[PDB]
Amino acid sequence: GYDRALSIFSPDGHIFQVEYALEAVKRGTCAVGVKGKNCVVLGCERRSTLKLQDTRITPSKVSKIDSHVVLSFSGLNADSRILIEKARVEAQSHRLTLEDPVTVEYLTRYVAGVQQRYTQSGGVRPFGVSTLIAGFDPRDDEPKLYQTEPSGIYSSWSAQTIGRNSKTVREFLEKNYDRKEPPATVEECVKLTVRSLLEVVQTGAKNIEITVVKPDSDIVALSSEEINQYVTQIEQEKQE
Amino acid sequence: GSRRYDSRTTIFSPEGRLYQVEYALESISHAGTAIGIMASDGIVLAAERKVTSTLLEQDTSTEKLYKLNDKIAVAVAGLTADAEILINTARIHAQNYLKTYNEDIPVEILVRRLSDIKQGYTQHGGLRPFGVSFIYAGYDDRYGYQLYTSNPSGNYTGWKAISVGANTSAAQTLLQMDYKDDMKVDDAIELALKTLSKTTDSSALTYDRLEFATIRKGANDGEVYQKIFKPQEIKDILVKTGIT
Amino acid sequence: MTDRYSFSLTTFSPSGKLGQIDYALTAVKQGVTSLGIKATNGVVIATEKKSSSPLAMSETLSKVSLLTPDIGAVYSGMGPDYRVLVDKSRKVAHTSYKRIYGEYPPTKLLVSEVAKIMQEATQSGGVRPFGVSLLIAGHDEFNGFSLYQVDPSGSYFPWKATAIGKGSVAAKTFLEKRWNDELELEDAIHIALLTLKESVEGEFNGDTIELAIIGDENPDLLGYTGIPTDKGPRFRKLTSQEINDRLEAL
Amino acid sequence: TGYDLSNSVFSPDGRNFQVEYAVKAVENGTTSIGIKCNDGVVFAVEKLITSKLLVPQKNVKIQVVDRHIGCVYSGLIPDGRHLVNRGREEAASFKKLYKTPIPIPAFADRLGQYVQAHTLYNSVRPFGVSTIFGGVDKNGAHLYMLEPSGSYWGYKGAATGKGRQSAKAELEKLVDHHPEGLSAREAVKQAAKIIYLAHEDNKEKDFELEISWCSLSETNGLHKFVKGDLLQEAIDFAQKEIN
Amino acid sequence: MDIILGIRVQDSVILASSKAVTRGISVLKDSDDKTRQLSPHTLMSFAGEAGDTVQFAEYIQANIQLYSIREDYELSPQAVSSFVRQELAKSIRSRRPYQVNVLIGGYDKKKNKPELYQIDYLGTKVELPYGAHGYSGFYTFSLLDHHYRPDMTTEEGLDLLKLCVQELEKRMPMDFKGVIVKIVDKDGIRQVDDF
Amino acid sequence: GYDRHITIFSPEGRLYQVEYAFKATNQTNINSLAVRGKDCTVVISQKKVPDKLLDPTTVSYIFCISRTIGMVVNGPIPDARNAALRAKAEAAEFRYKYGYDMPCDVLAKRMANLSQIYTQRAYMRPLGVILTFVSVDEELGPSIYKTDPAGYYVGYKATATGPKQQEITTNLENHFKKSKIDHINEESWEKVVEFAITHMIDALGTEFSKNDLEVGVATKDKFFTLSAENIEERLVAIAEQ
Amino acid sequence: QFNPYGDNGGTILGIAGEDFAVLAGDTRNITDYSINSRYEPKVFDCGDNIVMSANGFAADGDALVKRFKNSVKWYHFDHNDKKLSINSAARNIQHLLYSRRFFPYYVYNII
Amino acid sequence: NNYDGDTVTFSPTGRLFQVEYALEAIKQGSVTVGLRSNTHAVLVALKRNADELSSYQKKIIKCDEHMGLSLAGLAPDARVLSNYLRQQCNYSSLVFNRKLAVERAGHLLCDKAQKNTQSYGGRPYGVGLLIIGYDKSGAHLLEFQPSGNVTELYGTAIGARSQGAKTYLERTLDTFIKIDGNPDELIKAGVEAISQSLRDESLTVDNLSIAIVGKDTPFTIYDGEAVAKYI
Amino acid sequence: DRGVSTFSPEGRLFQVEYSLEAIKLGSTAIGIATKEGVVLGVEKRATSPLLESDSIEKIVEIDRHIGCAMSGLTADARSMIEHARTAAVTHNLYYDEDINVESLTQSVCDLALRFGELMSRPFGVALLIAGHDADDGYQLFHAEPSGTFYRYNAKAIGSGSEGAQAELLNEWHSSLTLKEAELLVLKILKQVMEEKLDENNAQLSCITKQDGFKIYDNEKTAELIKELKEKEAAE
Ligand SMILES: [Cl-]
Ligand SMILES: [Mg+2]
Ligand SMILES: [Mg+2]
C-alpha cells in the first residue's frame, strides 16, 4: 500500500501540509456560528459566481449529523462529505452501543480526531476543512457551539466564523457580541448572524443561508423571503 | 529507494490547491463542449465530438453520452477511458441499490457515490485523479428532473443549465442570457444547439460532429423515456432549429 | 523487496498533458504501418512483416493474431507489449464472458475489456502505459462486422477504415479516396494491398506481408462435423500464396 | 548522471555502479584466502589486532555451514554473517527434502541467486562482501569465490580483501609448481605463509592467524578449525619463510 | 420470543406482540416490548432466538436511521422491508445465522396506504392484509379469514384483534402474558395503553 | 532526467534502461553461434578462462534446462544463472501441469513475457542477457529461439550473438544464400558441429584449441554438452581436410 | 480419537496462618493404575515469597507454573524490580487461565 | 553527500554514511566502561543529567540473572535491543533449559542490527552497547556497534572521551585480568578507568552507576549511596 | 525528498529535532514536585475573546493518582492520553493495583519512535506527567517525542521554558509546601505569559496521595492569584 509520509515537520517546526490545508479553508465560503440564550444559529455564505444553479438539489452547506446536532464547514466541499459521513455513522454507532445520542462535545471530539489522524498517517493528506458543530445535548437546554480545524484541535465558542473574510466578520462579532447578555430571543440571534454576514457577503439576496437549531431536536432552515426581511430591516435602521 | 520517483499526487500547494486536480481541470478544458439544460417537462443533453474524420463509423460510435440506467444518463468531458471506468462503477451502484431496496436509485445518491470515488483519489492512494467531468441528467419521483455536474476534485453541484469542457465561460454566459424557468424541452433543445454553434472551435456545426440526447416524460403516461439521438435524427433537428 | 512503487508513474503536467501516454503514442508513431478496412461482407487487417534479420524465420513471429474465432487483431508499436495484450485479451474473453454466457463476446465488448486493461496501466501504481495502438477487427450476430482502434490511453474508436504507425497520415488519406459503403471483401483486400505498398520500402510479397480477414464462416477450419449450428471461425489468416495471387492482379 | 545513486539501475555503459561501490567495501576489508588440495579445501583469514584488549582466539571469523562446508569473507562482516545464515537455511531445507547433505556446487548457486537478487531492486543494498567457501561432497573437493554482483566460479586457489594481489601471485606459484596436486597438511602450511606474506599490505597493525579445513583423509570430510600444535606448526613455517 | 400478530386495515397497520420473556422455567418479565421504530411511519415487531432478536432489530434500526439522516428522507415501507429481507437472506448462509422473524408495519406517505410485510428468518418476504409468525397463525388465521375486510376501521381492526388474542389465550398451552398493541398510520406510531 | 533510471518512456518513446541492458549483454566479450542440422541443433560458444586460478570445468555459459532443451546465454553470469534457474523451474512446472515436455519456442515465449514485465513494471530491472534456446522439437523439428531484454523473441534458421555477431551473421547469411535451404544438410551431428566451428573460425579469423570452445548439441529426446576431448576430436577432423 | 487431556492424580493443601502460610502436596505421579514417580515435586517456589501448585493434568500444570514464573520475571523488568504482591499474582494468574477459556489448563491451582 | 539520504546506498568509496552517522550518536553519548577478570565482569557508567532539577539518565539495563549491558547513544534504541536480548535469553531458558551464551547473544544482536542497514525505509540503531555476563565458559565482555560489528574484549569503553579510559585499560591489561575472587578491587579498577575520561565534572553519588556479574554473583546494579563506597 | 527516519551528520534524527521546534511554539506548562504533592499549571492562550476559555483542556487526568499537562501541537496528545488511560486501567485489570508513574511514562514513550514509512511522523507535543505511587512517592516526568523521559523536581515546557527553568533553578528547594508550590507556578506563569495572568487564561492542578488528581476551580485559583499579588506587594 501507499505509505508515503506526506505530513512531516520542517526545520522551523511546522507541518506545511496542515498549514496549506488551512489555506484551502481560507479560500472556502464564509461560515458563521452564533449561540443565543436558548438557541444556536448557523449562517453560511453562497458565492453568487454560480447562477443557473438548482437550489432544490444542490448540496446544502449545513448538514444534520443527528436529529439534535448540525455541522457546517468552510474549505474543500468533497472533503467535508467524508467527515460528515463518518460523523453520521459514529452518531448511530454511539446510540447503538451506549443507548444515548452523542453529546455535541463528543461528536466534535470524534470529528477532530479523524482530522488529526489524517495529519500523522502514511499515504494520506490532511482534510482541507474547518467545521462548526452546533446543537443541544439530550435533555439539556444549554446551547453548544464548537469549531474544528485540519490540525485536529477543537474548542468551544460563544460565537465564531470561518472561511474567506472571516477576519472581518470575527472583528464584527468581537465588538457586537456581549457575553454577559447574549441574544435573548431567536430574532436577535438571527439578526446578529445576518448582520455579521452582511459585512462580507455582497448582496443579501440568495447569498445568505440561515439555519436555526433549538433544544429538543428542533431544527429548521429559513427561506429566502424570511432572510430577506432581516436584510431589509437592518439596512433601513442603518440609514440614520 | 522508490521515494525518489514519487510525484506525490495528493498534496496541497502553498496556496491550498490540489495540484493534480487543477491540472486535470486544465486537461478537461481542451475536451469537446458538453451542455445540459433542464426544463419543466424534460432534460436535454448536447455534446460536441472532437475533430472527427470522414472514415469514423458514427452510428456505432459513443464518446460523449452514456446510459447509467433507464432514468439517468451522463455527458462526458475529458479522458474517455477514465470515464468508462467510472461509468461501469456507477452502473453497478445503481443495480446494487435496486437489488437492496427494490426501487430505482435517486439521482443525487448515484452522483454522490461517484463524486466520493473521485474525492478518494485526491486524498489517498498516491494515484493520479480521473481526468473527467460529468454532466448527470436524470429523473426520480422525489425531485423530478435534475441536472448535476462533478469534476476531478469530487465536488458536485446542481444546475438548471450547465456546460463542461471547452469554452464553458462563453457557453455559460449564453445560457444565462436566454434561459428562463418556464422553458420547455423543445425550446431547450434549440438553446443547447444554438449555444454549441456559437462556442464551437469548428468552422460549422454539423450532424457528424454531435451527440445528442433527451430525457422526457413525453412517454405514454406517467413514466420517463431516454432518447439517444441517431445520426439522421441529429441531422433533422439541426434543420428544424435552422442551423444547417 | 516488495513492489514499493504503489504510486502513479503517469501524472498530469501543468498544461494538462499526461506525458507517459503522449510518449507512448510517439513510440506507436515510430512503429511499422498497419491498417484495417471494413467491407459490406467482411473486414481486412494488414501489416508489414519487418524482419529483424534474414536468418530469422519471420513466419514464427505473428503480428496478426486470433483473439476469438470471429475476432482478430493487429498492432503498431512495441511488439512485446502487443504479445502480452493478446494473451490477456484471449483470457479475458473466456473469464469475463464465455464462462458466463457460454458464447464468445461481441467485438465491441472484447475491445472494451482490452481498453480497460490499457487504461489501468495508465493510472495504476508502478507501471508505464502500453506502447501500442491496436486495430481489432471482428464479427458478431447482432452488430455485424466491425473495426476498432485502441490507443495507449485506453480510448477506442470504431472505424470504417484506418491506419496506424509510420505512414498513417498518408495511408488514411489514401483510404478516404478509395473507401465507399458498397465495397465487397475482395475489393477491400485489393485496396489494403495498394495502401500498404506505399509505406513499404523493400520486398513486397506474401512472405513480407501479413494479412488476415474476418469474413464468411469456415467449416473446413472447425475441426469437427455433426453440429449444424457450429459453422466454423470467421477469422482467417491469408497464406503467402493467396497474397501473391492477388499481387498479380494489382 | 545520477545512475550510481540507486541500486539496480543500468548506467549507459551497462554497469551497476552500486555493485561496483560494494566491491570497494570488499577491497577495504582484511585478507582472506582459500586453497584447494588433493582431497579437500583449506581456508585462512587475516584478523587485525586493533588493540591489546581484544581476547585472542575468541572473535572467530570463519563460519561453518551444515557440517561439511566452510565459509570465510572479506568486507562488511555483518553482511557476511547474514549471507551465512541464509546459506544455513538453504542447506537445511535441501537436506530436509533430499536427505543427502547439500553438494558444494548446489550450495554455491543458492548463495549466488540470493546475492544476485540483491542487485535487482532499489529497495535493497548489494552485499558488501566477497565470500570464499567450499568443502567435500560425493564428487570430491570444491572451492568457490562469490562476489557482490552474485558472480561466482570454481577455483584452484582464491583470495580477496586488501592483500588480494599479493595472495593471488603466491597462489599462482603453487598451481604451477604442483600440477600433480597439493596435500591437505601442505595446504595448511602454505595458507599460513600466504596470509603472512599478504600482511605486508596491512603492516601497520599486527594480526592473528586463523585457519580451517575440510579433508576426506584428515577430517573425514567434515569442516574443522586448525588448533593447537598443528596451528603453531603452520605459524612457525610461515614465520620461517618471511625471514 | 413467541407471539407477534399484524393486521392492515383501511388507513392503518396494527401490530400486537406478547409481553412475556422466559428464562429456564421462570418468567423474568411480563411487560417486554418486542418492537423497534425504524422510522416515524415504520414499525418492526420481532420474534425468535434469545438475544439475536434485539441485536438484529437495533442493527436494522441504526441502518434506517442512518439512511434518513444522510438523505433527509424517509424510506418507503416497501424499501425498508426489502433491505430487511436481504439482510436475513444474507444471514441464513452465514457461519451463525440470525434466528429472527419479523413483521414490518408501515404507512406509505406517498401512496397514502398502510402496508404490512411478513418476513421469516430465511428471508421469505410476503405482503399481507394480516400476518403472524410461528404457531400464532394456526389459531388466528381462521378468524381473520372469516372476519377481515379491507375497508375496516382502526376500531374494528382492534376488535378483531381482541378476538384473536382471546382465541390464543383459550387454546394455547402457553401463557404469553397478554400483548402490547401499536398502531401505525399517517400521523405516525402510537401505543394503545389499555388492551 | 529520471526517465533514464527506471523503465518509463522518454520523450522520444524510448526505454533507456532496456537499451542499456542490451549493452551489458556484451560485457563478457564472448561470441555464440547456433545452427540447425537435419536431425539436430548445434550451439557453440567461445570459452575464455583468463585467470589460472580458476577451475575451467565450472566456467560455462551453456545450460541444460530440461532433457530436451538447452540454453546458451550472452551476458553476465549472475543474470545468466537467474534466467537458467527460472527456465528450469518453468520447464518442470509445464510438464507437471500439462503432461508433456515444454517446447523450445513455448519456453522462449514464456521467458520473453517475463522479460516484457520488467520493461513495464518499475520495481523490477531488466536482465542484461540474451537467451538462445535450442532443441529438436517433436512437432517442429530442429529449433532455435532467442530472447532479449526488450521481451522480443523469434525463431531462427541460424543465429549468432556477441560483440562480433554481425561478422558471424553475414558469414552464415552468405552460406544459406548459396545452399538455398533452411539448415545444414548433414546426417551426423558431429559434422554439423564441425560446420559450426569452421564457420566461426572463418568469420572471426581466429584459430581454436580444445579449451577455447564450448559446445552444446540437441538431438531427439536429449540435449548434451561436449567435453574437451570430444571437441579435440572435432578440431582434428577439421584440420585434416 | 486423540484425547489431549490426562490425569496425573496427586493432592494439594493450602492453609493460611496469622503471620504464615503453608502449601503442601504429595509427591506421587500416576497414570491409571500405575506409578510414574514416587518423588515428582509439585509445589514450587516462584520467587517474591510466593509458592504455587497446579494440580491435575501435569503437562498443563508445568506449563502454567512455568508461565507464572516467567510473568514474575517480566514484572521485575517492566516495573523497576517491584515485589509482586500475592493479590497481584492472583489476578495475573486469572488472566493466564482465561486466555485458554476454550482449551483450558486442566488444573486446580493454589498459591 | 549525495549518498547519505538512506541506509540502502553505498558511497563511491564503499561507505555507508547513515551507519556512520548512527555511529556518531554514540560519540555524543556519555562515557561507559567495561572490564573483566576470570571470575567477574564489571560495567561502570557515567550517567548524564538534563539540568540540576533533573534526574540522571540510567545507563545500565539487566537482561537476565547472568547477563546485562550498558548503553551509549539513543536510549530508546537500547530499550528495544535490550528487550530483544531479554526475550532471547528467556527463549533459551524456557525451550532448552539453558542459559544463553554471551557469545551467542552477541551474534543475535549483530544479525538484528544488520537487517536495518540493508533494507529501505528503516534506519540503523543509534546506540552502542557493552554486554557483560557469566556463562559456562566463564566471564565475558562484548562491545556492540550498530553497524553490526560485535567484538569480545578483556576491557573497553565507549562514548564521549572514551579514548582516555581505553588507553588506561590497555596499560592495566595484565593487572586487572588477574583480579580473581575480589569484586571490590575489580570495580576500583573500573572506577579508576572511567576517571581518565572525566573533564571538569567528577564522580558524585547520583552521577556514578556500577554493575557486576560473576561466578556466584547474579547481575546486580548499584546506584545512589551504594556506590559512595567507591567514590 | 528524504527518509522520515534519517540521521543527520551530527547523529540526530531530523524529524525528532524538528518536532522539538514545534513544542517551543506551544503555550507554557509548568510542573513542580514537593513532598506534599505535585503541582501542574498551564497557560491557556485563547486566540480570541469569544473563545470560551473553560473548554481549553491542556491539563488532563490519566488515573486517580496520575495527572498530565501538555505543550505543543495539543491535538497529537489525544491518542497519547488515550493510550495512557488504557495502559493505567489495563494494568489495574491484570494486577489489581495502581501502576507506577515511571511505568506509565515508559508506556507513553514507547509510542514516540514508532514512526516511519506505524504513524507517519513523530508527535509534536511534550507532556509533563505528574503522579504518586507507594514505591517512589511524588514524581514528575517530562516525556518527549524522542522517546526519552527525564524525572524532574521542577520543569517548564513551551515558549517561555528556558526563562521559566532558570527561575525554577533558583526557587526550588526540597522543603517546599504545596501552597508555596502553587504560588510559585502562578508567579512564573505570570512572568512568561504575554497577556495578564488571571483565573480565565491560566489553570492550576495538583496530585496528592489523599485526594488524588484534581483540577482547580477558577474561583479557587482566583484566590491564589490575589494571595500572590499581596505577598509580592509585601516587600
Ligand atoms: Cl506468460
Ligand atoms: Mg414468512
Ligand atoms: Mg523495470
mmCIF file of C-alpha atoms in Angstrom, chain E:
data_model
loop_
_atom_site.group_PDB
_atom_site.id
_atom_site.type_symbol
_atom_site.label_atom_id
_atom_site.label_comp_id
_atom_site.label_asym_id
_atom_site.label_seq_id
_atom_site.Cartn_x
_atom_site.Cartn_y
_atom_site.Cartn_z
ATOM 1 C CA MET E 1 -39.939 -14.945 21.876
ATOM 2 C CA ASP E 2 -43.394 -16.275 20.895
ATOM 3 C CA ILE E 3 -46.484 -14.467 19.535
ATOM 4 C CA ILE E 4 -46.451 -11.494 17.139
ATOM 5 C CA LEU E 5 -49.551 -10.551 15.111
ATOM 6 C CA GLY E 6 -50.213 -7.958 12.421
ATOM 7 C CA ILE E 7 -53.261 -6.602 10.587
ATOM 8 C CA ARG E 8 -53.590 -3.972 7.836
ATOM 9 C CA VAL E 9 -56.924 -2.107 7.825
ATOM 10 C CA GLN E 10 -58.261 0.809 5.699
ATOM 11 C CA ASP E 11 -55.969 3.587 6.935
ATOM 12 C CA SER E 12 -53.533 1.953 9.398
ATOM 13 C CA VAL E 13 -51.441 -1.078 10.378
ATOM 14 C CA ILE E 14 -51.873 -2.662 13.817
ATOM 15 C CA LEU E 15 -49.159 -4.814 15.423
ATOM 16 C CA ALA E 16 -49.751 -6.948 18.535
ATOM 17 C CA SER E 17 -46.811 -8.571 20.349
ATOM 18 C CA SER E 18 -46.619 -10.671 23.542
ATOM 19 C CA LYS E 19 -45.120 -9.286 26.759
ATOM 20 C CA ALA E 20 -43.565 -12.451 28.238
ATOM 21 C CA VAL E 21 -39.839 -13.215 28.459
ATOM 22 C CA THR E 22 -38.865 -16.649 29.801
ATOM 23 C CA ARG E 23 -35.506 -17.946 31.027
ATOM 24 C CA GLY E 24 -35.376 -21.565 32.191
ATOM 25 C CA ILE E 25 -38.678 -22.332 33.940
ATOM 26 C CA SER E 26 -39.201 -18.748 35.174
ATOM 27 C CA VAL E 27 -40.958 -15.805 33.509
ATOM 28 C CA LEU E 28 -38.436 -12.986 34.052
ATOM 29 C CA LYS E 29 -40.606 -10.206 32.604
ATOM 30 C CA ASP E 30 -44.290 -9.673 31.722
ATOM 31 C CA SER E 31 -44.059 -6.190 30.146
ATOM 32 C CA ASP E 32 -41.471 -6.614 27.371
ATOM 33 C CA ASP E 33 -41.899 -4.518 24.211
ATOM 34 C CA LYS E 34 -40.904 -6.688 21.228
ATOM 35 C CA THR E 35 -40.679 -3.848 18.705
ATOM 36 C CA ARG E 36 -38.491 -1.040 17.331
ATOM 37 C CA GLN E 37 -39.408 2.135 15.467
ATOM 38 C CA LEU E 38 -37.331 2.125 12.267
ATOM 39 C CA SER E 39 -38.691 5.493 11.095
ATOM 40 C CA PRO E 40 -41.570 7.851 12.058
ATOM 41 C CA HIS E 41 -44.049 5.880 9.887
ATOM 42 C CA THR E 42 -42.453 2.385 10.017
ATOM 43 C CA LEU E 43 -42.614 -0.099 12.913
ATOM 44 C CA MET E 44 -40.996 -3.549 13.144
ATOM 45 C CA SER E 45 -42.026 -6.254 15.616
ATOM 46 C CA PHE E 46 -39.826 -9.330 16.074
ATOM 47 C CA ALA E 47 -39.687 -12.857 17.477
ATOM 48 C CA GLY E 48 -37.016 -15.575 17.573
ATOM 49 C CA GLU E 49 -33.963 -16.843 19.471
ATOM 50 C CA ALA E 50 -32.997 -15.010 22.688
ATOM 51 C CA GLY E 51 -30.538 -12.112 22.240
ATOM 52 C CA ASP E 52 -30.435 -12.354 18.429
ATOM 53 C CA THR E 53 -33.837 -10.638 18.121
ATOM 54 C CA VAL E 54 -32.957 -7.323 19.776
ATOM 55 C CA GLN E 55 -29.466 -7.247 18.226
ATOM 56 C CA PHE E 56 -30.912 -7.662 14.723
ATOM 57 C CA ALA E 57 -33.752 -5.166 15.297
ATOM 58 C CA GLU E 58 -31.412 -2.476 16.660
ATOM 59 C CA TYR E 59 -28.955 -3.094 13.800
ATOM 60 C CA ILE E 60 -31.761 -2.574 11.267
ATOM 61 C CA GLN E 61 -32.960 0.495 13.197
ATOM 62 C CA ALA E 62 -29.461 2.023 13.095
ATOM 63 C CA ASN E 63 -29.179 1.483 9.322
ATOM 64 C CA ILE E 64 -32.578 3.040 8.519
ATOM 65 C CA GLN E 65 -31.900 5.995 10.843
ATOM 66 C CA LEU E 66 -28.518 6.457 9.120
ATOM 67 C CA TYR E 67 -30.278 6.495 5.740
ATOM 68 C CA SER E 68 -32.857 9.024 6.989
ATOM 69 C CA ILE E 69 -30.157 11.452 8.172
ATOM 70 C CA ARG E 70 -27.999 11.052 5.042
ATOM 71 C CA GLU E 71 -30.816 11.744 2.550
ATOM 72 C CA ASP E 72 -33.125 13.814 4.806
ATOM 73 C CA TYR E 73 -35.885 11.498 3.582
ATOM 74 C CA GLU E 74 -37.959 8.591 4.914
ATOM 75 C CA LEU E 75 -37.680 5.293 3.009
ATOM 76 C CA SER E 76 -40.947 3.670 1.940
ATOM 77 C CA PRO E 77 -42.126 0.606 3.923
ATOM 78 C CA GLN E 78 -41.518 -1.467 0.772
ATOM 79 C CA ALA E 79 -37.903 -0.271 0.524
ATOM 80 C CA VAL E 80 -37.275 -0.957 4.229
ATOM 81 C CA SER E 81 -38.801 -4.450 4.001
ATOM 82 C CA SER E 82 -36.571 -5.295 1.021
ATOM 83 C CA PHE E 83 -33.499 -4.083 2.935
ATOM 84 C CA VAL E 84 -34.503 -6.243 5.918
ATOM 85 C CA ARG E 85 -35.167 -9.298 3.714
ATOM 86 C CA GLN E 86 -31.735 -9.025 2.069
ATOM 87 C CA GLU E 87 -30.031 -8.875 5.476
ATOM 88 C CA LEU E 88 -31.847 -12.055 6.552
ATOM 89 C CA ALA E 89 -31.174 -13.839 3.226
ATOM 90 C CA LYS E 90 -27.519 -12.831 3.631
ATOM 91 C CA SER E 91 -27.656 -14.131 7.226
ATOM 92 C CA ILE E 92 -29.104 -17.619 6.569
ATOM 93 C CA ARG E 93 -25.945 -18.808 4.749
ATOM 94 C CA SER E 94 -23.575 -17.242 7.317
ATOM 95 C CA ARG E 95 -21.493 -19.222 9.826
ATOM 96 C CA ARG E 96 -24.070 -18.469 12.535
ATOM 97 C CA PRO E 97 -27.440 -17.251 11.134
ATOM 98 C CA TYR E 98 -29.683 -14.811 12.992
ATOM 99 C CA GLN E 99 -32.805 -16.715 14.005
ATOM 100 C CA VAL E 100 -35.261 -13.802 13.848
ATOM 101 C CA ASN E 101 -38.751 -13.479 12.372
ATOM 102 C CA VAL E 102 -40.239 -10.011 11.822
ATOM 103 C CA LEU E 103 -43.386 -8.121 10.874
ATOM 104 C CA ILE E 104 -42.928 -4.673 9.330
ATOM 105 C CA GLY E 105 -45.928 -2.354 9.639
ATOM 106 C CA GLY E 106 -45.656 0.979 7.839
ATOM 107 C CA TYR E 107 -47.725 3.802 6.372
ATOM 108 C CA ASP E 108 -46.568 4.935 2.922
ATOM 109 C CA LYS E 109 -46.996 8.734 2.889
ATOM 110 C CA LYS E 110 -46.507 8.891 -0.903
ATOM 111 C CA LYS E 111 -49.265 6.411 -1.820
ATOM 112 C CA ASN E 112 -51.353 7.142 1.314
ATOM 113 C CA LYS E 113 -51.674 3.417 2.047
ATOM 114 C CA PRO E 114 -50.933 1.186 5.049
ATOM 115 C CA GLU E 115 -48.606 -1.768 4.361
ATOM 116 C CA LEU E 116 -47.813 -4.960 6.294
ATOM 117 C CA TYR E 117 -44.842 -7.189 5.418
ATOM 118 C CA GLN E 118 -44.143 -10.623 6.913
ATOM 119 C CA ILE E 119 -40.508 -11.799 6.788
ATOM 120 C CA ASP E 120 -39.166 -15.015 8.357
ATOM 121 C CA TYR E 121 -35.558 -15.802 9.342
ATOM 122 C CA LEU E 122 -34.803 -17.404 5.941
ATOM 123 C CA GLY E 123 -35.582 -14.091 4.187
ATOM 124 C CA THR E 124 -39.045 -15.113 2.979
ATOM 125 C CA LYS E 125 -40.985 -11.889 2.325
ATOM 126 C CA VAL E 126 -44.730 -11.580 1.693
ATOM 127 C CA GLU E 127 -47.050 -8.546 1.687
ATOM 128 C CA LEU E 128 -50.291 -9.416 3.516
ATOM 129 C CA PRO E 129 -53.537 -7.917 4.877
ATOM 130 C CA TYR E 130 -52.862 -9.841 8.094
ATOM 131 C CA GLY E 131 -49.964 -11.999 9.261
ATOM 132 C CA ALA E 132 -48.255 -13.882 12.070
ATOM 133 C CA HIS E 133 -45.166 -15.941 12.924
ATOM 134 C CA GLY E 134 -44.657 -19.379 14.469
ATOM 135 C CA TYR E 135 -47.778 -21.133 15.768
ATOM 136 C CA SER E 136 -49.763 -17.877 16.147
ATOM 137 C CA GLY E 137 -51.300 -18.228 12.664
ATOM 138 C CA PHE E 138 -52.603 -21.752 13.354
ATOM 139 C CA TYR E 139 -55.102 -20.364 15.888
ATOM 140 C CA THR E 140 -55.843 -16.904 14.445
ATOM 141 C CA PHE E 141 -55.952 -17.129 10.619
ATOM 142 C CA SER E 142 -59.367 -18.857 10.580
ATOM 143 C CA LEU E 143 -60.865 -15.892 12.473
ATOM 144 C CA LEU E 144 -59.087 -13.388 10.223
ATOM 145 C CA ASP E 145 -60.106 -15.273 7.044
ATOM 146 C CA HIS E 146 -63.726 -15.039 8.246
ATOM 147 C CA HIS E 147 -63.990 -11.502 9.686
ATOM 148 C CA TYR E 148 -61.429 -9.441 7.719
ATOM 149 C CA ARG E 149 -62.487 -6.730 5.250
ATOM 150 C CA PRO E 150 -60.109 -4.239 3.570
ATOM 151 C CA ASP E 151 -62.380 -1.263 4.398
ATOM 152 C CA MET E 152 -62.302 -1.915 8.175
ATOM 153 C CA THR E 153 -61.762 0.989 10.566
ATOM 154 C CA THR E 154 -58.948 1.054 13.137
ATOM 155 C CA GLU E 155 -61.513 0.385 15.897
ATOM 156 C CA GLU E 156 -62.934 -2.645 14.053
ATOM 157 C CA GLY E 157 -59.361 -3.858 13.488
ATOM 158 C CA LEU E 158 -58.737 -3.692 17.245
ATOM 159 C CA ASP E 159 -61.967 -5.611 17.987
ATOM 160 C CA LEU E 160 -60.984 -8.384 15.552
ATOM 161 C CA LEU E 161 -57.522 -8.378 17.144
ATOM 162 C CA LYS E 162 -59.035 -8.830 20.630
ATOM 163 C CA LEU E 163 -60.936 -11.866 19.327
ATOM 164 C CA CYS E 164 -57.655 -13.340 18.010
ATOM 165 C CA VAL E 165 -55.920 -12.850 21.378
ATOM 166 C CA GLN E 166 -58.906 -14.387 23.214
ATOM 167 C CA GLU E 167 -58.685 -17.477 20.980
ATOM 168 C CA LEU E 168 -54.931 -17.701 21.614
ATOM 169 C CA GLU E 169 -55.475 -17.349 25.376
ATOM 170 C CA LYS E 170 -58.047 -20.189 25.248
ATOM 171 C CA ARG E 171 -56.328 -22.787 23.027
ATOM 172 C CA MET E 172 -52.575 -22.204 23.520
ATOM 173 C CA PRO E 173 -50.868 -24.158 26.350
ATOM 174 C CA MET E 174 -48.537 -21.155 26.613
ATOM 175 C CA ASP E 175 -49.065 -18.150 28.905
ATOM 176 C CA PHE E 176 -47.672 -15.221 26.885
ATOM 177 C CA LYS E 177 -48.844 -12.560 29.399
ATOM 178 C CA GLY E 178 -51.082 -10.545 27.049
ATOM 179 C CA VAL E 179 -49.954 -8.244 24.232
ATOM 180 C CA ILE E 180 -48.741 -4.699 23.610
ATOM 181 C CA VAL E 181 -50.659 -3.184 20.689
ATOM 182 C CA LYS E 182 -49.316 -0.385 18.476
ATOM 183 C CA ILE E 183 -50.981 1.499 15.610
ATOM 184 C CA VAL E 184 -49.151 2.861 12.551
ATOM 185 C CA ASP E 185 -50.967 5.479 10.438
ATOM 186 C CA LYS E 186 -50.496 8.821 8.600
ATOM 187 C CA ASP E 187 -49.883 10.656 11.903
ATOM 188 C CA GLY E 188 -47.139 8.203 12.949
ATOM 189 C CA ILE E 189 -46.839 5.498 15.607
ATOM 190 C CA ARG E 190 -48.807 5.319 18.865
ATOM 191 C CA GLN E 191 -49.375 2.692 21.569
ATOM 192 C CA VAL E 192 -52.783 1.505 22.801
ATOM 193 C CA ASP E 193 -52.211 1.720 26.574
ATOM 194 C CA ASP E 194 -55.399 -0.203 27.516
ATOM 195 C CA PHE E 195 -55.831 -3.680 25.985
#
